[PDB]
């Protein structure tokens with residue numbers, strides 16, 4: 001009835017900041033890596049209700065270009081991350097998105113994340129390109145910095161609000 005558990009997965013290319021977004025959200029710190037068993041949790045509040053976010057970092061899946069069924073199983077939300085300094089990470093979004101289409105529950109919320117927003121001297125992908133990609137595919141989008149915490153809390157909380165309100 002009254003308390004909630006939302007399973008999240010974090011997906012996207014190598015080095016986009018999946019691990020750092022996890023650690024920033026759960027521990028408020030920015031930095032070992034146990035592939036296949038790399039996770040964290042944090043309690044939040046939406047509409048006065050207690051919601052436990054159980055969050056899975058899918059590092060190690062990148063080489064496969066696909067997410068194992070056990071990550072998708074019961075996943076309520078997914079953060080699909082690219083690295084704004086590396087256009088190739090932006091280019092591979094459609095293949096991550098198709099993997100999710102084929103193998104995830106259609107109700108799984110997906111938020112598009114352009115990470116490393118602090119790195120303005122190396123930006124390759126404009127914020128507007130992330131926005132347009134998200135619109136075309138019916139997703140919410142935010143730029144984050146796992147380094148500075150910018151929009152990190154907002155990304156996880158807004159995903160949860162979308163899951164809860166759907």
Ligand SMILES: Nc1nc2c(ncn2[C@@H]2O[C@H](COP(=O)(O)OP(=O)(O)O)[C@@H](O)[C@H]2O)c(=O)[nH]1
Pocket residue numbers: 012013014015016017018019020021031059115116117118119144145146147148
């Ligand atoms: N400046 C900056 N560096 C970041 C950010 N997120 C991650 N990094 C750096 O990028 C590297 C890769 O991030 P990581 O979380 O390990 O990527 P992953 O393979 O997707 O898990 C890290 O070692 C950090 O040095 C960010 O928001 N800003």
Ligand SMILES: [Mg+2]
Pocket residue numbers: 018019020057058059
């Ligand atoms: Mg990782």
